[PDB]
Design a protein around this ligand. Structure first.
Ligand SMILES: CC(C)C[C@@H]1CCO[C@@H]2[C@H](CN[C@@H]2C(=O)N[C@H]2[C@H]3O[C@H](SCC/C=C\[C@H]2C)[C@H](O)[C@@H](O)[C@H]3O)C1
Ligand SMILES: [K+]
Ligand SMILES: [Mg+2]
Ligand SMILES: [Mg+2]
Ligand SMILES: [Mg+2]
Ligand SMILES: [Mg+2]
Ligand SMILES: [Mg+2]
Ligand SMILES: [Mg+2]
Ligand SMILES: [Mg+2]
Ligand SMILES: [Mg+2]
Ligand SMILES: [Mg+2]
Ligand SMILES: [Mg+2]
Ligand SMILES: [Mg+2]
Ligand SMILES: [Mg+2]
Ligand SMILES: [Mg+2]
Ligand SMILES: [Mg+2]
Ligand SMILES: [Mg+2]
Ligand SMILES: [Mg+2]
Ligand SMILES: [Mg+2]
Ligand SMILES: [Mg+2]
Ligand SMILES: [Mg+2]
Ligand SMILES: [Mg+2]
Ligand SMILES: [Mg+2]
Ligand SMILES: [Mg+2]
Ligand SMILES: [Mg+2]
Ligand SMILES: [Mg+2]
Ligand SMILES: [Mg+2]
Ligand SMILES: [Mg+2]
Ligand SMILES: [Mg+2]
Ligand SMILES: [Mg+2]
Ligand SMILES: [Mg+2]
Ligand SMILES: [Mg+2]
Ligand SMILES: [Mg+2]
Ligand SMILES: [Mg+2]
Ligand SMILES: [Mg+2]
Ligand SMILES: [Mg+2]
Ligand SMILES: [Mg+2]
Ligand SMILES: [Mg+2]
Ligand SMILES: [Mg+2]
Ligand SMILES: [Mg+2]
Ligand SMILES: [Mg+2]
Ligand SMILES: [Mg+2]
Ligand SMILES: [Mg+2]
Ligand SMILES: [Mg+2]
Ligand SMILES: [Mg+2]
Ligand SMILES: [Mg+2]
Ligand SMILES: [Mg+2]
Ligand SMILES: [Mg+2]
Ligand SMILES: [Mg+2]
Ligand SMILES: [Mg+2]
Ligand SMILES: [Mg+2]
Ligand SMILES: [Mg+2]
Ligand SMILES: [Mg+2]
Ligand SMILES: [Mg+2]
Ligand SMILES: [Mg+2]
Ligand SMILES: [Mg+2]
Ligand SMILES: [Mg+2]
Ligand SMILES: [Mg+2]
Ligand SMILES: [Mg+2]
Ligand SMILES: [Mg+2]
Ligand SMILES: [Mg+2]
Ligand SMILES: [Mg+2]
Ligand SMILES: [Mg+2]
Ligand SMILES: [Mg+2]
Ligand SMILES: [Mg+2]
Ligand SMILES: [Mg+2]
Ligand SMILES: [Mg+2]
Ligand SMILES: [Mg+2]
Ligand SMILES: [Mg+2]
Ligand SMILES: [Mg+2]
Ligand SMILES: [Mg+2]
Ligand SMILES: [Mg+2]
Ligand SMILES: [Mg+2]
Ligand SMILES: [Mg+2]
Ligand SMILES: [Mg+2]
Ligand SMILES: [Mg+2]
Ligand SMILES: [Mg+2]
Ligand SMILES: [Mg+2]
Ligand SMILES: [Mg+2]
Ligand SMILES: [Mg+2]
Ligand SMILES: [Mg+2]
Ligand SMILES: [Mg+2]
Ligand SMILES: [Mg+2]
Ligand SMILES: [Mg+2]
Ligand SMILES: [Mg+2]
Ligand SMILES: [Mg+2]
Ligand SMILES: [Mg+2]
Ligand SMILES: [Mg+2]
Ligand SMILES: [Mg+2]
Ligand SMILES: [Mg+2]
Ligand SMILES: [Mg+2]
Ligand SMILES: [Mg+2]
Ligand SMILES: [Mg+2]
Ligand SMILES: [Mg+2]
Ligand SMILES: [Mg+2]
Ligand SMILES: [Mg+2]
Ligand SMILES: [Mg+2]
Ligand SMILES: [Mg+2]
Ligand SMILES: [Mg+2]
Ligand SMILES: [Mg+2]
Ligand SMILES: [Mg+2]
Ligand SMILES: [Mg+2]
Ligand SMILES: [Mg+2]
Ligand SMILES: [Mg+2]
Ligand SMILES: [Mg+2]
Ligand SMILES: [Mg+2]
Ligand SMILES: [Mg+2]
Ligand SMILES: [Mg+2]
Ligand SMILES: [Mg+2]
Ligand SMILES: [Mg+2]
Ligand SMILES: [Mg+2]
Ligand SMILES: [Mg+2]
Ligand SMILES: [Mg+2]
Ligand SMILES: [Mg+2]
Ligand SMILES: [Mg+2]
Ligand SMILES: [Mg+2]
Ligand SMILES: [Mg+2]
Ligand SMILES: [Mg+2]
Ligand SMILES: [Mg+2]
Ligand SMILES: [Mg+2]
Ligand SMILES: [Mg+2]
Ligand SMILES: [Mg+2]
Ligand SMILES: [Mg+2]
Ligand SMILES: [Mg+2]
Ligand SMILES: [Mg+2]
Ligand SMILES: [Mg+2]
Ligand SMILES: [Mg+2]
Ligand SMILES: [Mg+2]
Ligand SMILES: [Mg+2]
Ligand SMILES: [Mg+2]
Ligand SMILES: [Mg+2]
Ligand SMILES: [Mg+2]
Ligand SMILES: [Mg+2]
Ligand SMILES: [Mg+2]
Ligand SMILES: [Mg+2]
Ligand SMILES: [Mg+2]
Ligand SMILES: [Mg+2]
Ligand SMILES: [Mg+2]
Ligand SMILES: [Mg+2]
Ligand SMILES: [Mg+2]
Ligand SMILES: [Mg+2]
Ligand SMILES: [Mg+2]
Ligand SMILES: [Mg+2]
Ligand SMILES: [Mg+2]
Ligand SMILES: [Mg+2]
Ligand SMILES: [Mg+2]
Ligand SMILES: [Mg+2]
Ligand SMILES: [Mg+2]
Ligand SMILES: [Mg+2]
Ligand SMILES: [Mg+2]
Ligand SMILES: [Mg+2]
Ligand SMILES: [Mg+2]
Ligand SMILES: [Mg+2]
Ligand SMILES: [Mg+2]
Ligand SMILES: [Mg+2]
Ligand SMILES: [Mg+2]
Ligand SMILES: [Mg+2]
Ligand SMILES: [Mg+2]
Ligand SMILES: [Mg+2]
Ligand SMILES: [Mg+2]
Ligand SMILES: [Mg+2]
Ligand SMILES: [Mg+2]
Ligand SMILES: [Mg+2]
Ligand SMILES: [Mg+2]
Ligand SMILES: [Mg+2]
Ligand SMILES: [Mg+2]
Ligand SMILES: [Mg+2]
Ligand SMILES: [Mg+2]
Ligand SMILES: [Mg+2]
Ligand SMILES: [Mg+2]
Ligand SMILES: [Mg+2]
Ligand SMILES: [Mg+2]
Ligand SMILES: [Mg+2]
Ligand SMILES: [Mg+2]
Ligand SMILES: [Mg+2]
Ligand SMILES: [Mg+2]
Ligand SMILES: [Mg+2]
Ligand SMILES: [Mg+2]
Ligand SMILES: [Mg+2]
Ligand SMILES: [Mg+2]
Ligand SMILES: [Mg+2]
Ligand SMILES: [Mg+2]
Ligand SMILES: [Mg+2]
Ligand SMILES: [Mg+2]
Ligand SMILES: [Mg+2]
Ligand SMILES: [Mg+2]
Ligand SMILES: [Mg+2]
Ligand SMILES: [Mg+2]
Ligand SMILES: [Mg+2]
Ligand SMILES: [Mg+2]
Ligand SMILES: [Mg+2]
Ligand SMILES: [Mg+2]
Ligand SMILES: [Mg+2]
Ligand SMILES: [Mg+2]
Ligand SMILES: [Mg+2]
Ligand SMILES: [Mg+2]
Ligand SMILES: [Mg+2]
Ligand SMILES: [Mg+2]
Ligand SMILES: [Mg+2]
Ligand SMILES: [Mg+2]
Ligand SMILES: [Mg+2]
Ligand SMILES: [Mg+2]
Ligand SMILES: [Mg+2]
Ligand SMILES: [Mg+2]
Ligand SMILES: [Mg+2]
Ligand SMILES: [Mg+2]
Ligand SMILES: [Mg+2]
Ligand SMILES: [Mg+2]
Ligand SMILES: [Mg+2]
Ligand SMILES: [Mg+2]
Ligand SMILES: [Mg+2]
Ligand SMILES: [Mg+2]
Ligand SMILES: [Mg+2]
Ligand SMILES: [Mg+2]
Ligand SMILES: [Mg+2]
Ligand SMILES: [Mg+2]
Ligand SMILES: [Mg+2]
Ligand SMILES: [Mg+2]
Ligand SMILES: [Mg+2]
Ligand SMILES: [Mg+2]
Ligand SMILES: [Mg+2]
Ligand SMILES: [Mg+2]
Ligand SMILES: [Mg+2]
Ligand SMILES: [Mg+2]
Ligand SMILES: [Mg+2]
Ligand SMILES: [Mg+2]
Ligand SMILES: [Mg+2]
Ligand SMILES: [Mg+2]
Ligand SMILES: [Mg+2]
Ligand SMILES: [Mg+2]
Ligand SMILES: [Mg+2]
Ligand SMILES: [Mg+2]
Ligand SMILES: [Mg+2]
Ligand SMILES: [Mg+2]
Ligand SMILES: [Mg+2]
Ligand SMILES: [Mg+2]
Ligand SMILES: [Mg+2]
Ligand SMILES: [Mg+2]
Ligand SMILES: [Mg+2]
Ligand SMILES: [Mg+2]
Ligand SMILES: [Mg+2]
Ligand SMILES: [Mg+2]
Ligand SMILES: [Mg+2]
Ligand SMILES: [Mg+2]
Ligand SMILES: [Mg+2]
Ligand SMILES: [Mg+2]
Ligand SMILES: [Mg+2]
Ligand SMILES: [Mg+2]
Ligand SMILES: [Mg+2]
Ligand SMILES: [Mg+2]
Ligand SMILES: [Mg+2]
Ligand SMILES: [Mg+2]
Ligand SMILES: [Mg+2]
Ligand SMILES: [Mg+2]
Ligand SMILES: [Mg+2]
Lengths: 48, 275
RNA sequence: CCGAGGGUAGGGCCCGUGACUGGGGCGAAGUCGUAACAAGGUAGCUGUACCGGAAGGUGCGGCUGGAU
RNA sequence: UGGGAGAGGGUGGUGGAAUUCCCGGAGUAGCGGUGAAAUGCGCAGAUACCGGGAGGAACGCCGAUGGCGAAGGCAGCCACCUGGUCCACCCGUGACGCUGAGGCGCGAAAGCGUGGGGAGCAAACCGGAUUAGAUACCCGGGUAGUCCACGCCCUAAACG
RNA sequence: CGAUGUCGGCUCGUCGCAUCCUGGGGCUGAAGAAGGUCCCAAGGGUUGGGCUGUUCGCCCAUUAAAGCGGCACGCGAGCUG
RNA sequence: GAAUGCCGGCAUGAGUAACGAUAAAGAGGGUGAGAAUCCCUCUCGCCGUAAGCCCAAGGGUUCCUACGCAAUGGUCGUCAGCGUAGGGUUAGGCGGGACCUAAGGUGAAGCCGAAAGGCGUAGCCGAAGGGCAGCCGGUUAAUAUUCCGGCCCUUCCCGCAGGUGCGAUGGGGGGACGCUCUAGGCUAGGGGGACCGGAGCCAUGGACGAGCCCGGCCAGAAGCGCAGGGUGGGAGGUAGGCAAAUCCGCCUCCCAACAAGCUCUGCGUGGUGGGGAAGCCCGGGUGACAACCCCCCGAAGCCAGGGAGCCAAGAAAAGCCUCUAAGCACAACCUGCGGGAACCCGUACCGCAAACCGACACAGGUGGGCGGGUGCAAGAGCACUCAGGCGCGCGGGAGAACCCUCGCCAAGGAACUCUGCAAGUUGGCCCCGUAACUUCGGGAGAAGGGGUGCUCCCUGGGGUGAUGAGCCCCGGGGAGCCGCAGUGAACAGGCUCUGGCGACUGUUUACCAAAAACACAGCUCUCUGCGAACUCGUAAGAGGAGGUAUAGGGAGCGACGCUUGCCCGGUGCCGGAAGGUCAAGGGGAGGGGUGCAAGCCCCGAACCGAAGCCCCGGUGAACGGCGGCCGUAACUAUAACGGUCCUAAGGUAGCGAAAUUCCUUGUCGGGUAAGUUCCGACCUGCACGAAAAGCGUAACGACCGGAGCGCUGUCUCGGCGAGGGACCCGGUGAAAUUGAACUGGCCGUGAAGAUGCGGCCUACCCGUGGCAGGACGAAAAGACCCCGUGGAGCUUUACUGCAGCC
RNA sequence: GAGCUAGCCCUGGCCAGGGUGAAGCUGGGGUGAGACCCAGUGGAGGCCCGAACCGGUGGGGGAUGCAAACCCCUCGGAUGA
């Protein structure tokens, strides 16, 4: 049947993207946290 | 005269529709329509604040002239009577000798080709607008301002009217469509006559689908719900109210008055509605 | 081919009969009240409507076939 | 052809008396009701009195043993639309008449449908009396209804 | 109670005997035929259906007879539900 | 050494289950160390409204080629979507951007919030909507509306010519719109041709034929033609379109009007440029100077912004045209022609799937377009087929039980069972014919029946064309032929009677409930006079509503019909300027501490003092509630009647052993041979009853009862047959479980149900196919039950707070 | 976190074929005029049959599955809430 992951590049960028994260105190702490941990990707990769 | 249907479906048996016999023009005036942003009952938070709204037919909003003292002395001709999906009354298209075109809500008995005018000097005729202080006591009136220059506020629904009861100082005394006796300032404008389309009240929607067309989503009884949802929720099997009948939010709903007590306009309500 | 009739299916009319139920007639001395006939003790009757163990009562309108 | 009388019918308007409720005044110890009472109402200011407002219904005197209509029935006043009818003249048509199974229409009250309206009155219903009882008569309340529009009902001591 | 699946049916049997039938008997208020009652006997047999989820029970039509009980009220790693 | 401990390794189950749709394979020839599995050929089967083709998303090199086979591939592998390497994606016109706006988002001004932040007009952003200029063919191993060829077109810059009051982010027009139905003319697409072009073919009894087989087009500028869409012209006044306006709007006058004209699309033709089959021969070449024509069918597509009707009344903004404003009129704009200029991103490949979402090369899920022919009434249904694509990545045998899916069955025909569950039966079209009841629509496909193929003969009407022929579409009558059978295959209702519940179509527990539950039109109560009530928010601000009592919120009831009784004492709600109580505050009789004293400081009675509560009324489609005992009639029995106690009042109409009745399978009647169910009655209703509505009700129902007909493998009662498994051989090879095991029966014993203890009995060692009685078999630290001063959801006249409101 | 699911908002798209035959309109009849009747035309509807599409009624299979909800047969809706 229809499953829960239905990929959509525009949805992915507008929801989890770098510019969505910077617009918000909570989103900015995510970027801060993921940098401190040393993540190679701060944000999901989307083709655009 | 509401129109009936032969019972050739279960729903056509009781469905009635307006006769639309007063209507003379069947597409609106392009310079006077703007899009009507449907809300679905949602506020600017996105939250539902009025339950059970949405999914009705698409509509354009017809700009209506609720001042009319905008154009004192300038007569106008009645060019058309049209359907308005945003109100129960019909609307009347006015061609001013100015060249300006405007909509008013159509009073009972108005005729295409007759002329209407507004001002202190206007003939006491159907369709004319005067300040309340110049209209003879006893005249049936509609589209009544509540405060001067603030816009017609009272008696706008199909078939309604207010009646001038008397004068006291700078104020006239009106019997509102509800039967309330109120003092309204004499400078307030009002239009001679009752609102038309008085057969509106006798339309039988006929089926559930017809409520969906009007943007009315199904209404769920409190007694059909669970206690998480409603004071009347729950119980094994059916259940009486078991408490004073209440709204979803806990307040009582069979008699509890809710007009704010210390309201400044109380000084101007003579007698509350009856019946 | 038609054809007595036999078969299948579905209708119409009549008769008999049926747990139970509805009122009706009748029946020497049952129980309750007293509606009508006297202004019958609230004049009567009336079509209708509502109510009441029961006769009845009451409303609306009509009639005199009502009295003084 | 010329005239007449009439609550004949339909539509719209509009006038005063009274009842009720509301507001203002003034005023105090009761009011109301009956055969007698009680219920009820009233010092939270009733009743009685004056001024003001709102609303509905019915039209006093004229009024009669009267008038009109086929009947049911029709009563303030005004305008408009409309029916029947009688008299005068003796002018026109030339028996064109009478009745009338069916049919069609009208048809008091009550009642029914959808709206409206609702002062007074009042089935049901409540209470107070009475009574052996009193699902009555009498008293205090009172909802349909009574009123308007449209549509049904089609009855009668619809009787001379 | 870190699970011994629970009513009834179906299927499949197997056992007990306090025996429903059939076999052998004594007594009879056993003329005969048919019964009653007790004793011996478990080899075999012990029907079809209407009603109800029913077990049970009642009823219809038969029968030599239409037995009662145990097996985790036998049997859900066999079925049903 | 134990923690259902943690991490890792390795066992057991086991050469076991399985190897992923039952669309299906066989052989020959290649290649190679090796071949059922790779390549080629022939034969066979499967899809064909797809299992073919083309877009979009998503994926991201998977594409093409060479070289490879460790691992990946459920087997094999020489093959591959795999490993290595090289190559491959070309645009002014296709899509997106340098254009426009939608919801929404953001947000100069402004508003609000302890901070973070929340709002917000314009503006901006935002598309699969609006706007905008490319069609056909060829070419590569792999791209192509992109390269090439042919014929076309757009914008920007500059210049030349001609014209004009030029000029805008401002005014106006336009853009610009629904649903159903639908005209005319066309195109796409299709069928036929005795015509035109073609390599050939004559078989096996016959045919050298008006034979068979194959094909018979595509694109195209101006012009022209056919069909449509859009659009009145002139003048005079003018105060409206937030400046102006010669534009638009409004008034008057003249002319035009199913027209015409002007304009804009579509289709046809059109210079020209392309394509072009079978068969044969090795993707190619030939065929070929290919032919390229007539007739019929015909769109849901096109003309289009077409027409009609209906009510629920159907985006915006830019491009565009017109008007003027500053400005400028040596400019600028319009028209024509010429030269020049024309950027960024995407483009490979998969795409109903082995490349996307499902951990898998997973019987699942995934939006748009094309989707041929014949026959069956039609159709996208069904069967067979074209183009094209596949045989589903383990096979070979055997022909047991048993399982699945399927076919048939003597006699009977529901006897099966909780239940006709399941499976039969019925089945399309045409014709005849069709009941109670009904809201007059329906019930209705009621029920029940007849017809159905093929041949010959005569004949009616329509479309096209020409009025005719031809082709095509609807029919009518007569005479015959064959079979068991003519919707001869495939797709395609079993029916009736009678109850309960719900009026109805709808909606629901994604994944055990589709229902009688929810909703529903409709009815009633209630709140709300507008800065409405109410809702969300600390607020600002929103929704309500750009609505205004014929409206909006809340509540119950639930089409419709006939109805909806009595009780206001308690609770709620509504009214009530009195009286009672009442907090802060006011008041200050009167005290007290301290000081030598002026003073400073403290306590403080009466009395004034809100809402609320008490109190007085009202109110039931507000919460709710609507009796007991005893007696009595000239047979008995039973009580219309009476007595008395209690209540705020004592259940009315209607219904009743019921979706409610305990005793109960009540009693009686009906149906049956037999009826705990069913239907109709009765009424001592344990414990119906009137909007948590009462009693009915045509129609409707994958709801739940009861009965009958039809027909059946449901059954008596089972039998045979088919295929997929099971079984055997070759290949690959799991799992939960597992203290160790050398693991028998009876009667006992034992923590009370023993392979393991006692006594006896029985038993050579090891497997394979089967069956499930035991191992208190497995699974899951019982969900029932209790316990824990464990948890959570929910209620309230439990306690205590808080929001909100007064 | 609403790329699942629930509701709403904006903008698009889809629903083979066949059946039934409302209003209205025209004509005829009728009448004082009417209502109304008949025929034809017409093409309404939470109308009917049935694909796509959307569902999930009954049964069977599946149950270390093809599948952490699937498969076969059957069944509901299919111009509308
Ligand atoms: C009167 C009655 C209440 C007595 C009661 C009967 C109920 O059960 C029995 C209790 C006694 N214990 C039994 C029980 O727990 N049984 C479990 C089963 O669960 C499934 S069987 C399907 C579920 C059924 C039963 C469960 C409760 C597993 O496979 C089985 O192994 C078994 O654990 C008694
Ligand atoms: K329990
Ligand atoms: Mg889903
Ligand atoms: Mg999605
Ligand atoms: Mg995207
Ligand atoms: Mg996207
Ligand atoms: Mg998105
Ligand atoms: Mg989305
Ligand atoms: Mg976001
Ligand atoms: Mg972002
Ligand atoms: Mg911050
Ligand atoms: Mg920060
Ligand atoms: Mg790095
Ligand atoms: Mg992140
Ligand atoms: Mg109707
Ligand atoms: Mg109208
Ligand atoms: Mg506009
Ligand atoms: Mg709004
Ligand atoms: Mg917003
Ligand atoms: Mg709400
Ligand atoms: Mg809403
Ligand atoms: Mg409105
Ligand atoms: Mg309107
Ligand atoms: Mg005012
Ligand atoms: Mg209404
Ligand atoms: Mg609407
Ligand atoms: Mg509603
Ligand atoms: Mg509801
Ligand atoms: Mg509930
Ligand atoms: Mg519930
Ligand atoms: Mg919640
Ligand atoms: Mg709570
Ligand atoms: Mg609650
Ligand atoms: Mg409750
Ligand atoms: Mg409940
Ligand atoms: Mg209950
Ligand atoms: Mg419930
Ligand atoms: Mg209660
Ligand atoms: Mg409450
Ligand atoms: Mg409140
Ligand atoms: Mg009021
Ligand atoms: Mg015979
Ligand atoms: Mg009397
Ligand atoms: Mg008497
Ligand atoms: Mg008398
Ligand atoms: Mg008397
Ligand atoms: Mg009485
Ligand atoms: Mg006093
Ligand atoms: Mg009044
Ligand atoms: Mg004469
Ligand atoms: Mg009458
Ligand atoms: Mg009394
Ligand atoms: Mg007495
Ligand atoms: Mg009254
Ligand atoms: Mg008389
Ligand atoms: Mg246990
Ligand atoms: Mg365990
Ligand atoms: Mg266990
Ligand atoms: Mg003897
Ligand atoms: Mg024996
Ligand atoms: Mg039994
Ligand atoms: Mg038992
Ligand atoms: Mg029993
Ligand atoms: Mg036993
Ligand atoms: Mg026992
Ligand atoms: Mg058992
Ligand atoms: Mg089981
Ligand atoms: Mg069992
Ligand atoms: Mg077991
Ligand atoms: Mg076991
Ligand atoms: Mg230890
Ligand atoms: Mg361990
Ligand atoms: Mg552990
Ligand atoms: Mg571990
Ligand atoms: Mg581990
Ligand atoms: Mg290691
Ligand atoms: Mg390990
Ligand atoms: Mg290992
Ligand atoms: Mg092994
Ligand atoms: Mg094994
Ligand atoms: Mg396995
Ligand atoms: Mg497998
Ligand atoms: Mg298949
Ligand atoms: Mg198969
Ligand atoms: Mg072969
Ligand atoms: Mg082979
Ligand atoms: Mg091989
Ligand atoms: Mg090999
Ligand atoms: Mg193969
Ligand atoms: Mg090959
Ligand atoms: Mg061969
Ligand atoms: Mg095909
Ligand atoms: Mg992937
Ligand atoms: Mg390999
Ligand atoms: Mg290999
Ligand atoms: Mg190898
Ligand atoms: Mg592998
Ligand atoms: Mg695999
Ligand atoms: Mg090799
Ligand atoms: Mg390697
Ligand atoms: Mg490539
Ligand atoms: Mg190009
Ligand atoms: Mg640029
Ligand atoms: Mg923009
Ligand atoms: Mg954006
Ligand atoms: Mg944009
Ligand atoms: Mg776009
Ligand atoms: Mg483009
Ligand atoms: Mg082109
Ligand atoms: Mg090359
Ligand atoms: Mg090409
Ligand atoms: Mg528009
Ligand atoms: Mg649009
Ligand atoms: Mg519509
Ligand atoms: Mg063409
Ligand atoms: Mg064809
Ligand atoms: Mg001007
Ligand atoms: Mg050549
Ligand atoms: Mg289409
Ligand atoms: Mg179009
Ligand atoms: Mg806009
Ligand atoms: Mg100059
Ligand atoms: Mg010009
Ligand atoms: Mg640039
Ligand atoms: Mg490409
Ligand atoms: Mg698929
Ligand atoms: Mg593929
Ligand atoms: Mg996942
Ligand atoms: Mg595969
Ligand atoms: Mg797949
Ligand atoms: Mg073809
Ligand atoms: Mg067919
Ligand atoms: Mg295969
Ligand atoms: Mg397949
Ligand atoms: Mg395979
Ligand atoms: Mg074998
Ligand atoms: Mg055979
Ligand atoms: Mg048979
Ligand atoms: Mg039978
Ligand atoms: Mg039979
Ligand atoms: Mg049976
Ligand atoms: Mg059996
Ligand atoms: Mg059942
Ligand atoms: Mg049954
Ligand atoms: Mg069939
Ligand atoms: Mg019948
Ligand atoms: Mg009939
Ligand atoms: Mg019947
Ligand atoms: Mg019936
Ligand atoms: Mg009928
Ligand atoms: Mg028929
Ligand atoms: Mg038939
Ligand atoms: Mg025939
Ligand atoms: Mg034949
Ligand atoms: Mg024959
Ligand atoms: Mg069928
Ligand atoms: Mg239903
Ligand atoms: Mg239901
Ligand atoms: Mg019902
Ligand atoms: Mg009903
Ligand atoms: Mg439906
Ligand atoms: Mg479920
Ligand atoms: Mg569930
Ligand atoms: Mg679930
Ligand atoms: Mg299920
Ligand atoms: Mg359920
Ligand atoms: Mg259902
Ligand atoms: Mg529900
Ligand atoms: Mg309903
Ligand atoms: Mg109702
Ligand atoms: Mg109402
Ligand atoms: Mg709030
Ligand atoms: Mg708040
Ligand atoms: Mg705050
Ligand atoms: Mg607004
Ligand atoms: Mg509401
Ligand atoms: Mg209903
Ligand atoms: Mg409901
Ligand atoms: Mg009826
Ligand atoms: Mg009370
Ligand atoms: Mg009270
Ligand atoms: Mg009370
Ligand atoms: Mg009570
Ligand atoms: Mg109670
Ligand atoms: Mg009654
Ligand atoms: Mg009973
Ligand atoms: Mg009952
Ligand atoms: Mg009961
Ligand atoms: Mg019991
Ligand atoms: Mg019982
Ligand atoms: Mg019982
Ligand atoms: Mg019995
Ligand atoms: Mg019987
Ligand atoms: Mg039952
Ligand atoms: Mg009894
Ligand atoms: Mg209730
Ligand atoms: Mg109840
Ligand atoms: Mg019914
Ligand atoms: Mg019915
Ligand atoms: Mg249903
Ligand atoms: Mg159903
Ligand atoms: Mg039956
Ligand atoms: Mg069998
Ligand atoms: Mg076989
Ligand atoms: Mg062997
Ligand atoms: Mg092997
Ligand atoms: Mg392997
Ligand atoms: Mg293992
Ligand atoms: Mg050991
Ligand atoms: Mg050992
Ligand atoms: Mg052993
Ligand atoms: Mg052993
Ligand atoms: Mg023991
Ligand atoms: Mg033992
Ligand atoms: Mg042993
Ligand atoms: Mg041992
Ligand atoms: Mg020992
Ligand atoms: Mg031993
Ligand atoms: Mg031993
Ligand atoms: Mg032994
Ligand atoms: Mg073996
Ligand atoms: Mg074995
Ligand atoms: Mg076993
Ligand atoms: Mg077992
Ligand atoms: Mg066991
Ligand atoms: Mg154990
Ligand atoms: Mg066991
Ligand atoms: Mg488990
Ligand atoms: Mg634990
Ligand atoms: Mg435990
Ligand atoms: Mg557990
Ligand atoms: Mg549970
Ligand atoms: Mg316990
Ligand atoms: Mg405790
Ligand atoms: Mg403790
Ligand atoms: Mg606790
Ligand atoms: Mg919690
Ligand atoms: Mg808690
Ligand atoms: Mg707080
Ligand atoms: Mg978030
Ligand atoms: Mg979503
Ligand atoms: Mg969504
Ligand atoms: Mg459809
Ligand atoms: Mg169609
Ligand atoms: Mg038909
Ligand atoms: Mg017709
Ligand atoms: Mg028409
Ligand atoms: Mg339908
Ligand atoms: Mg299913
Ligand atoms: Mg079935
Ligand atoms: Mg499962
Ligand atoms: Mg399936
Ligand atoms: Mg199927
Ligand atoms: Mg259907
Ligand atoms: Mg359809």
């Amino acid at each position: 049947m229809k499953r829960t992951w239905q990929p959509n590049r525009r949805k992915r960028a507008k929801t989890h993207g770098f510019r969505a994260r910077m617009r918000t105190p909570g989103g900015r702490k995510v970027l801060k946290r993921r940098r401190q941990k040393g993540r190679w990707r701060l944000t999901p990769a989307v083709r655009k | 005269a509401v129109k009936k249907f032969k019972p050739y479906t279960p729903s056509r048996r009781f469905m009635t529709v307006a006769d639309f016999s007063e209507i003379t023009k069947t597409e609106p005036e392009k310079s006077l329509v703007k899009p009507l942003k449907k809300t679905g009952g949602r506020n600017n938070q996105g939250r539902i604040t009025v339950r059970f709204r949405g999914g009705g037919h698409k509509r354009l909003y017809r700009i209506i002239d609720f001042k009319r003292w905008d154009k004192v002395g300038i007569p106008a001709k009645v060019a058309a009577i049209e359907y308005d999906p945003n109100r129960s009354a019909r609307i009347a298209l006015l061609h001013y000798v100015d060249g300006e075109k405007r909509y008013i809500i159509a009073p009972d008995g108005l005729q295409v080709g007759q002329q209407v005018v507004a001002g202190p000097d206007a003939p006491i005729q159907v369709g004319n607008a005067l300040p309340l202080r110049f209209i003879p006591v006893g005249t049936v009136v509609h589209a009544v301002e509540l405060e001067p220059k603030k816009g017609a506020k009272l008696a706008r629904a199909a078939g309604t009217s207010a009646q001038i009861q008397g004068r006291e100082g700078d104020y006239v005394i009106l019997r509102l469509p509800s039967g309330e006796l109120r003092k309204v300032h004499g400078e307030c404008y009002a239009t001679v006559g009752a609102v038309g389309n008085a057969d509106h009240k006798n339309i039988v929607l006929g089926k559930a689908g017809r409520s969906r067309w009007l943007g009315r989503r199904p209404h769920v009884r409190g007694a059909a719900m669970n206690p998480v949802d409603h004071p009347h929720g729950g119980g094994e099997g059916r259940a009486p109210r078991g408490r004073p009948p209440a709204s979803p939010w806990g307040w009582q709903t069979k008699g509890l008055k809710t007009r704010k007590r210390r309201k400044p306009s109380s000084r101007f309500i003579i007698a509350r509605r009856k019946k």
